[PDB]
């Protein structure tokens, strides 16, 4: 694994999490963030991991949202929970 890529992906994980705790809920804000996260994850490895596909599935769901439509507060918690698992599962790979 390439160290600098790992470090990037780690940062990305923690950013999205941090953004969700700050109540980012628009497509506007989360689509770029997740795209980056997923690109970065993929750059360090193509191996699967617990909740990889769920995040992918989130980008679809998010992308499907109209402008000025927001994720619901239950959903923002769900996403956050998913990422925590994903990040833990990703960590296990290294």
From Swiss-Prot:
Positions of the UniProt region annotated as Interaction with VSP36 and VPS20: 1-94
Domain of life: Eukaryota
Domain VPS28 C-terminal residues, every copy: 1-94
Record localization: Cytoplasm; Endosome; Late endosome membrane
Subunit structure: Component of the ESCRT-I complex (endosomal sorting complex required for transport I) which consists of STP22, VPS28, SRN2 and MVB12 in a 1:1:1:1 stoichiometry. Self-associates. Interacts with VPS27; the interaction mediates the association with the ESCRT-0 complex. Interacts with VPS20; the interaction mediates the association with the ESCRT-III complex.
Note: Present with 1420 molecules/cell in log phase SD medium.
Functional description taken from the UniProt entry: Component of the ESCRT-I complex, a regulator of vesicular trafficking process. Required for normal endocytic and biosynthetic traffic to the yeast vacuole.
Family membership noted in the UniProt record: Belongs to the VPS28 family.
Listed name of the protein: Vacuolar protein sorting-associated protein 28
Whole-protein residues included: 148 to 241 of 242
């Amino acid at each position: 694994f390439n160290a600098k890529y790992v470090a990037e992906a780690t940062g990305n994980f923690i950013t999205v999490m941090d953004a969700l705790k700050l109540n980012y809920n628009a497509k506007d804000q989360l689509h770029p963030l997740l795209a980056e996260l997923l690109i970065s994850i993929n750059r360090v490895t193509r191996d699967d991991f617990e909740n990889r596909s769920k995040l992918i599935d989130w980008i679809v769901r998010i992308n499907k949202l109209s402008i000025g439509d927001t994720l619901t507060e239950t959903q923002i918690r769900e996403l956050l929970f998913d990422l925590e698992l994903a990040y833990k599962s990703f960590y296990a790979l290294l």
